[PDB]
Amino acid sequence: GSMFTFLLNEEETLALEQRLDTARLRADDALRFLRLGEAEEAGRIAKETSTQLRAEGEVAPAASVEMTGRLDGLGRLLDAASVGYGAQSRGVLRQAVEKRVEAVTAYEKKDFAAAAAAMDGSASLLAGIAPTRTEELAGLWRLEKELATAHAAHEAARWTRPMLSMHEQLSENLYFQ
Amino acid sequence: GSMFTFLLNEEETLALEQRLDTARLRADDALRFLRLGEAEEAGRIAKETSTQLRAEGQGQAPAASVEMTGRLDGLGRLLDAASVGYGAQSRGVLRQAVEKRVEAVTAYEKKDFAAAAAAMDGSASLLAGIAPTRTEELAGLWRLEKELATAHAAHEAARWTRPMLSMHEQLSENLYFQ
Amino acid sequence: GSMFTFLLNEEETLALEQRLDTARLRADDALRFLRLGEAEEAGRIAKETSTQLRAEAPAASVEMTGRLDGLGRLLDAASVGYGAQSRGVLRQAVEKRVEAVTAYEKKDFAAAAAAMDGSASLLAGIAPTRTEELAGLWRLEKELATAHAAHEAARWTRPMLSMHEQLSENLYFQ
């Protein structure tokens, strides 16, 4: 095809990339405890990870991108919950998955408010798998929502910053503005 | 990946990509029902998804190796879901299905892609034993995985034709790769 | 400030990549057997895959990231295959992976490597007559993380040496 190559000034994001990568490892291990029926420890890890992510932390993605990421976070939570509690709680887990199906239907219609509401419903239903650990399950869902938003903002800025530089260069070259 | 991004201004290529991603979410949720032993609902979703995906593709070439790499991943997804949903009761049947997947990977490594495709169909067929009243549902899930792998490889092939941005890796002050 | 591009066909690099991709498929199917409680067959495939990988200096941080991912795949397979009866052992193993991540975050890679080995060793307890097989699974995941880190380290020296050789040929032997 045809290639146009720009030389731009680097924006370094490595320490931020590693920080989100580490938060993702932490959330994964909280979910590994949930896969073993250990909601107390899963919740404690999630609370500390959320705390650390907020303490150490322009252009926002489109709402559709936010919901794509949050759907993935809900999927991770449901999959962990299903391994950890499917021996006993398939009734409640089926309800939670049904709600996630409604979230995808809303997402497909571009009704992102209904998508977000259905996803919150899905996570609330999981409280029924460990009713003495509902705060922990709620913290796991908050962490997944927080990591989804954080990754989407980093993925947005990763390409927005160079596209803005290119756009501004072409604007100067073509219109002398 | 993380070094490439595709401009999606054509809107019809936007809508085609979102349609494939959304059919993937649908198939994932059908597999989530299978992980809970709900083969009837898993199959109902798989058939609705296949029907809609085919209809919306109407009126709209990757190597055999590329097709099979994607189909192997679809088989992997189905096996993993069935193992969570039915491993407590049907490890005997699930073991047979995985053995057939192993044979498919051997055929794939030998570049015998016809044998690979056949061995994957045998793996999926053997899965019927975990839920003998829901054998049509289980075949519907496998067809959806194959259909999604075929569609994604096609969309991934029509990728070079679309405008795109790429970042080069800097090897030195004056030397880059892409 | 003129720009020149050398176009090179790296058939050997692609073949190396596919060899690692296929070994990933083999390792995954070993883990699939573990998810079904079939530790004997899992370890057999692991041993056979490690042998084939052997017949056919990494950066520390990259190898450690790969090892942590390998440990995650092993803990996830083991939780599915044995979580119904061996949760006490598996919980201890996950605790060690958490220690490994903390050490990794501090770039204390000796402590991270020790914790990961401890995590995998604790997994042995889920199938006490098959701990050789479970150890074999973990060795394969570490060998794969070493092979990917080695591949990444030599990713540019390979085509650079090929280019250097082609330029030398054209400049001095034509």
Q: What CA–CA distance (Å, rounded) separates C56 from B72?
A: 23
Two tokens, residue C48 = 């056979």
**Residue A27 Ramachandran class (φ > 0 left, ψ -120 to 50 alpha, else beta):** alpha
In our burial notation (b when 16+ CB lie closer than 10 A, e otherwise), range A93-118 reads bbbbbbbbbbbbebbeeeebeebbeb
Give the amino acid at A130.
A
Contact present, A33 and C91 (Cβ < 8 Å): yes
Contact call for residues B104 and B123 (beta carbons, < 8 A): yes
Chain C residues close to B98, C-beta within 8 Å: 29, 32-33, 36
Q: Which residues, 6+ apart, have CB-to-CB distance to C136 below 8 Å?
A: C43, C46, C47, C50
CA–CA dist C13, B52 (Å, integer): 40
Residues of C in CB contact (< 8 Å) with B are: 21-22, 25-26, 28-29, 32-33, 35-38, 41, 45, 80-81, 84, 156, 159-160
Pairing type for strands B175-177 and B169-172 reads antiparallel
Distances (CA, A) of C43 to B106, C25, C27, C106, C140: 17, 15, 10, 33, 10
Q: How far is CA C161 from the centre of its chain?
A: 26
Best CA proximity match to C144, nearest among C39, C44, C74: C74
Residues belonging to chain A with any Cβ–Cβ distance to chain B shorter than 8 Å: 1, 64, 68, 71, 75, 78-79, 82-83, 86-87, 90, 93-94, 97, 100-101, 104, 107-108, 158-159, 162-163
A83–C79: do the CB atoms touch at under 8 Å?
yes
Q: How far apart are CA C24 and CA C66, in angstroms?
A: 12
- The span from the CA of A96 to the CA of A126, in Å, is 6
Q: Where are the domains of chain B?
A: 8-163
What tokens were used for B8? Answer: 């999606």
Distance separating alpha carbons of residues B88 and B75, to the nearest angstrom? 20
SS3 A23: helix
Cβ atoms of residues A76 and A148 within 8 Å:
no
Cα–Cα distances in Å, from B9 out to B1, B16, B162, C127? 19, 12, 10, 55
Which stretch of DSSP H or E encloses residue B5? strand B4-6
Distances in whole angstroms, Cα of residue A32 to Cα of each of A16, A39, B28, B95, C112: 24, 10, 20, 24, 18
DSSP B10: S
Closest to C7 (Cα-Cα) out of B52, B11, B177: B177
Inspect the interface and report whether the beta carbons of A29 and C83 lie closer than 8 Å: no
Distance CA C76, CA A49 (A): 21
| Nearest C-alpha in B relative to C4 | B175
Question: Please, which experimental method was used?
Answer: X-ray
Show residues of chain A in contact with B88, CB under 8 Å.
87
| Whether C75 contacts C68, CB under 8 Å | no
Core vs surface per residue B107-146: b (16+ CB within 10 A) or e = bbbeebbeebbebbbbbbbbbbbbbeebbebbbbbbebbb
Cα B33 to chain centroid distance, Å, stands at: 17
> Do A112 and A67 contact (CB within 8 A), yes or no?
yes
Sign of CA dihedral C127, C131, C133, C139: positive
| B102: helix, strand or coil | helix
Among A97, A101, A106, smallest CA distance to A78 is for A97
